[PDB]
């Protein structure tokens, strides 16, 4: 075939790989920040559910 086919195929491939590399760097940074802080959906370790607490008079005023 002609050179334009290989030229444009290489251009598309280069775009795909560059986007993938940038996405991988962003993923690593996001993971590091998320584990360090814990304010995102990832790395949310469970805590005690508050629906288990009994809110009723307890035979003693001071709980």
């Amino acid at each position: 075939d002609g050179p334009e086919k290989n030229y444009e195929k290489t251009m598309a491939i280069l775009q795909i790989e560059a986007e993938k590399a940038e996405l991988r760097l962003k993923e690593l940074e996001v993971r590091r920040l998320m584990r360090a802080r814990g304010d995102g959906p990832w790395y949310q370790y469970p805590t005690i559910d508050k629906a288990l607490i009994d809110h009723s008079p307890k035979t003693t005023p001071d709980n």
Binding site: Y7, T10, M11, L14, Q15, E17, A18
Partner: protein, 175 residues
């Protein structure tokens, strides 16, 4: 022949002496040339004429590919891979063109040296000067880049040379 342009490959007018037979002894060179012409050049010329007339009955063309200009690596972003790719391919094509230019100059130098005979040291001074200039330019451009050469490395070499020469010029002017 018109197959190659005369200006790019110059040739002197190639003046030749005239036969001045001092004696009546017949030289064998002329007789041998005549017989060689008679029984070699004629059949070859007829065969070539036949082949050429066969070619003329079916004529078709092929064209030289023209390439557009694209932005260099100097106006290419840091991580813009597409512009970097285009600039790199353009730089490689320019590299090949420069190599062929140097090849042309070398061919002219060799032809002049062989043609001038025993006075080559004097009569081909211009060709040697042209080759010296082109070789210095090529060495400044592309030499020492390494096996993994690229447009970025050539640009870095040019920048370093520009810094060196600017510092030298500033030091000379301020002196």
């Amino acid at each position: 022949p018109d197959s190659w342009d005369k200006d790019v490959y110059p040739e002197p007018p190639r003046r030749t002496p005239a036969p001045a037979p001092q004696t009546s002894l017949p030289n064998p060179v002329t007789y041998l040339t005549k017989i060689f012409d008679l029984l070699v050049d004629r059949p070859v010329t007829l065969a070539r004429e036949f082949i050429e007339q066969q070619h003329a009955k079916n004529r078709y063309y092929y064209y030289h590919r023209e390439f557009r200009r694209v932005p260099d690596i100097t106006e290419c972003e840091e991580k813009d891979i597409l512009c970097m790719f285009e600039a790199e391919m353009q730089w490689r094509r320019d590299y090949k063109v420069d190599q062929e230019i140097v090849n042309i100059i070398q061919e002219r130098l060799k032809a002049c040296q062989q043609r001038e005979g025993e006075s080559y040291r004097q009569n081909c001074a211009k060709e040697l000067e042209q080759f010296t200039q082109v070789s210095k330019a090529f060495q400044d451009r592309y030499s020492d880049l390494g096996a993994h050469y690229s447009a970025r490395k050539c640009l870095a070499k040019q920048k370093q040379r520009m810094l060196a020469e600017r510092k030298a010029a500033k030091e000379a002017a301020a002196a």
